[PDB]
Symmetry: C3
Subunit: 494 residues, 3 copies
DNA sequence: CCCAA
DNA sequence: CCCAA
DNA sequence: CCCAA
């Protein structure tokens, strides 16, 4: 069923930020499964407890981009998220028009693994044919980015996209207003912004932007929207300017604005991908298959020189995730002679760029990690860099590697982890049970601060300690008790 | 025999512009065969008919270059061309000194297919050895282009190249003066310019430039001439300047001038080809043979990324036919999975660059052209672009593909084809017999205009309608009747 | 034994400049073998003879770099070199601390072929792991070159590096002062500069720079020294500036200075090699092994286009020996169809860049050198270029090829060789015995000039003529008689 | 692997 | 195929 | 080999 798959996607698969295709932003030890729709129904049915503050804060997870710029993913508190997901499920007949939006490529869709939101799920076949069909006969390409699609989207504009702005103003119940209310409750009862990473906020953004897509489609524009990025194909240059103008009016109707720095008009034919993508693939040592596995095994010189050229392209161009693309090109065609060289190169690049840290888990088995403790020092230096740069993705993945592979962590970097206080990193540290007293001191400071949003920012740590009977429930409601009684575990075993 | 091969080359093979090596400028449905030297002798023997105007105009065929710049190829009227080819044949003993010109690479030569003029016929072996032998010991390379070798060459300078300028001035019969007269009669009795594409004008240009080559050779210069482009290899820089000066005086002796924008002096060692050629071949996915056909079959990612890199190189460098070179690199190593992707990419690039249109005939069989009529819309949009940009090569090749592969053509683009009025495109439209009344209206307008040059500009259309008994002969001479009686057909069946 | 291997390395293997890894700076017909430590002991024991001048001059050998910049290698006179090598051997216990210097990569080391100094002997395994371990956790790379490590190194600073500057000043016997004296006697009793190429001067430079390396190491700096080039890896930018400052003080302590033009600070991660190295290897047609020899045989188009791209990279970047790297990439994977093309390309590039001349010996057998005498003209034009540009490496290698392969040399270029008067080229000319009277006139001019340094600059030519009984010994000592009596030959047969 | 320092 | 939006 | 002049 579409409805049941939507419910299980919202809670069991796309609650945590898990929208990436190949490697996740979060280590795989964190999983939102065993959090079923029945449990969320029981949470939403709970009315006990008193909150001094209005709304709920969320666990914040800082993941670096390719330019080391932090992006704040969020894990919503399960009470507010359960209510929001239940309301989205209950009115899915009125919401599912976002599925039949041909212009939006990244939208809800029934996937095999159980998700609804997967970025870049479509294959290169249909992708290539689609951009060649859209770009045919047109000599201008328009790239326009919404400035604040996650950070300043208007929750009160959720009705305005559904029934119209004027009709929603006269009408002030409808499901869109309740969706607005629950989306506000997801983040501290704040009217602006949505948590990045869950599919509920992606559904809300699709609902808001579907009216803009419909208005642009009714004017005859050929365009594709990936989340907030619009790519339009225009026969003439005034058509590009008119698309930009009409998109500006349609975004300003819902209190949104184009990123004036990011919008650009290029001459077709450009490239189907970015230019660095073709530069990398045309220089890839693994670009041709041989159908025998011994032939397509890369040597040391090939991979080392290709990664050096990738660093050259990242410095010179820097138009995207060049290093991650090249590493994913060469990481699966390695032989056992060259594992140490590529692994040390990945260690250096991962110290410089934390987004390359998860690739260390690809070759984490072949590398003799005991050795002469040099790898322990390198991993702890990576942890120091992650604590200094305040990035949660690299620290979480490195801590996952150290816990799984029994790499020892010094006390000095544990002090830096507590000073940073990333919720997922502290969840991993609590799951190791070595550092119980420091986690206890941290959560005691959070409790004695008596701020409800401070507890909400570490609800996952508090629930992981409560579920293992290491700490009482910080809240006075029954949501944590309901989740513990039905065996909800966000750090499950295999 | 050299003489008979020359005659049959001039009339049966190199009458139409057919000097290209791999793919012709004209679709293969047009052929100058079945136009034998005996028929041209009979045409030249004909003296009947009266012309109000002096000379003959020619069919004009606008072929795009790599930068979309139009180049006007010309098909000479068969009366003037027959007289010109007969005069060139009859005095071939006095003309054939252009064969023994070592500096001119593109010159008449007895070829297997029957032509005398084929551009770049020589193999990479002798080419590579020749530019390495010429460039050895020299540190300067001079590239100097004649500005108007086709557009402002002096017909009265045809005697001046043969017997000398002063001796030809005192002499004012000689065969060079009659060659001048027939070359003038080839284009409207105009003293300046030669029709591009036939080998008669190439022979005339070789005759004129052979004296310049002899004067440069007698001074000890090591140089190579490709049509109008001079490439000289010099030990010192003053030798380069002295070559430029002496070439300027030798060209000004025959009322020619160097293209001052195009001339340049580069430092040896450069590259044997252009720099983009080596950039393409060093990045080519097909650059290495494997001797088994399954191994050297390119995947989708390889060809798509190589063509994206080719578009990048065409935008960034633009020093030559980059896209045509890369397409010819990858078009013969395609598997049946990737035919649709590469064909759609070629359709887009061919809409943007009409010179890539003939490559659509390489994969015209494997593509399911019926489908859902999308390919029909794409071909008609290409026809619209060709009508708007006023290019005859792309329109002629697209019309050939549509007629051969039964792609339907709307009336709206037929209006644009009649508005453009390309002679070869209208020949194809008349050969389809669907659009008889519109072609009849067009030729009725040409007849009622009563301009002899206007009839000469569409002589091929008029003769194709006369040969199929769809229209009477527009002329009053017996040339068309002679060609019809001996079964001359410029649109023959296989 | 380490001591005996050091002695035989200093005299039999690393007397001549033979520090290169793959191809030597000197043709292999020159060999310093059959010059044993016993013979050098006998030379140093000799006290006969009188010298008007103090010290000895050395044979000068001008080898081009990648930018055609001459570098003066030197072959020390065997009396001064024998004394210097004997003194270095006799106190090797006090000198061998330069072996245990971890920061210096190019240092004395017991090698299989008998040398102690081989540049870049270490494999890519340990090299790659070492630069990845050193560059981990650091974001700045410092490249600082000593300006005059060969040309203005202070011989009187040899004690200052050993016992300290102040202690050596108070002390004014010690072995360092005698090493200073013998190093001065090696080059004309001059206090500044060392002869480039022998391992004795490399040992002296290592002795001087070992104190600087120790002072930089005791401050906690992570750095690597290749001859005169320092590469330091720093966590912060002030650490880079502090390394530069401390290295400046440590060099100024021994009257050395940094090359202020060459020093630079780059951002890690850069590339393990230079950027052009990865650009060449990522574009190399031979970069992947196939384990069957027929598959990894390069075609003509592959090598020709790769060498054209290499010339493009050498012109555009010019950061190192790009052409030599690419030629060594493609010279060992050639098939017999493409030998002529690559050989002519190498002939052109070797005329333009004499450092590529030794590669002509790789394919000197497969090329039909008799032919139509064109290769003779090309080799003599290369000899003319070498005489004009005053380069000894290209002339010596070309003369070796002409003598070995019986390529005739005209008298006109022999005049240019005598006018240049390179000692090794004249040694080869004397070893051919064709040009005996011209070599006799040259050495008669040197003798009648009555300058002892002029005889010392051609001591190798004088000894080669004396050993073959073609001329008497120019000196009045017994060193040449000792070398002749024990069969020392610097041009030995196989 | 293949250069140079 | 392999990124990101 | 594969373009253009």
């Amino acid at each position: 069923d579409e409805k049941r798959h939507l419910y299980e996607a919202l809670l069991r698969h796309n609650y945590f930020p898990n929208q990436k295709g190949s490697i996740s932003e979060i280590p795989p030890c964190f999983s939102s499964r065993t959090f079923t729709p029945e449990i969320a129904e029981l949470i939403s049915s709970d009315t006990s407890g008193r909150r001094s503050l209005q709304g709920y804060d969320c666990v914040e997870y800082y993941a670096t981009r390719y330019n080391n710029f932090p992006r704040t993913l969020s894990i919503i508190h399960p009470k507010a998220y359960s209510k929001l997901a239940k309301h989205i499920h209950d009115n899915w007949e009125e919401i599912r028009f976002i599925k039949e939006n041909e212009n939006s490529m990244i939208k809800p869709d029934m996937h095999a693994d159980g998700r609804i939101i997967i970025m870049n799920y479509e294959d290169a076949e249909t992708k290539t044919i689609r951009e060649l069909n859209d770009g045919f006969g047109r000599r201008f390409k328009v790239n326009a980015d919404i400035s604040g699609c996650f950070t300043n989207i208007y929750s009160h504009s959720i009705p305005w996209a559904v029934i119209g702005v004027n009709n929603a103003k006269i009408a002030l119940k409808h499901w869109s207003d309740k969706l607005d209310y629950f989306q506000r409750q997801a983040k501290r009862n704040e009217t602006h912004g949505v948590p990045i990473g869950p599919a509920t906020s992606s559904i809300v953004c699709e609902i808001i932007l579907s009216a803009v897509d419909k208005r642009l489609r009714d004017d005859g524009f050929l365009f594709r929207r990936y989340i907030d990025d619009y790519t339009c194909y225009c026969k003439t240059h005034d058509d590009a300017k008119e698309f930009l103008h009409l998109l500006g009016m349609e975004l300003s109707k819902y209190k949104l604005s184009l990123n004036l720095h990011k919008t650009k008009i290029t001459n077709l034919p450009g490239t189907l991908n970015d230019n660095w993508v073709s530069l990398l693939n045309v220089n890839s040592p693994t670009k041709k298959r041989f159908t025998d596995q011994d032939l397509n095994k890369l040597s040391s010189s090939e991979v080392i020189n290709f990664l050096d050229y990738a660093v050259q392209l990242n410095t010179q161009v820097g138009g995207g995730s060049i290093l991650k693309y090249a590493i994913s090109l060469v990481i699966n065609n390695l032989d056992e002679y060259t594992i140490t060289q590529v692994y040390d190169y990945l260690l250096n690049l991962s110290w410089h760029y934390p987004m390359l840290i998860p690739y260390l888990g690809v070759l984490i088995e072949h590398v003799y990690l005991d050795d002469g403790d040099e790898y322990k020092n390198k991993f702890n230096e990576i942890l120091s860099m992650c604590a200094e740069n305040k990035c949660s993705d690299g620290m979480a993945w490195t801590l996952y590697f150290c816990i799984k592979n029994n790499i020892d962590i010094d006390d000095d970097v544990i002090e830096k982890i507590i000073c940073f206080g990333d919720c997922l990193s502290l969840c991993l540290l609590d799951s190791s049970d070595i550092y119980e007293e420091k986690i206890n001191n941290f959560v005691s400071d959070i409790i004695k601060l008596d701020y409800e949003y401070d507890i909400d920012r570490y609800w996952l740590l508090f629930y992981q300690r409560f579920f293992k009977d290491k700490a009482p429930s910080p809240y006075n409601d029954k949501c944590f008790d309901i989740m513990k009684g039905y065996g909800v575990d966000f750090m499950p075993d295999e």
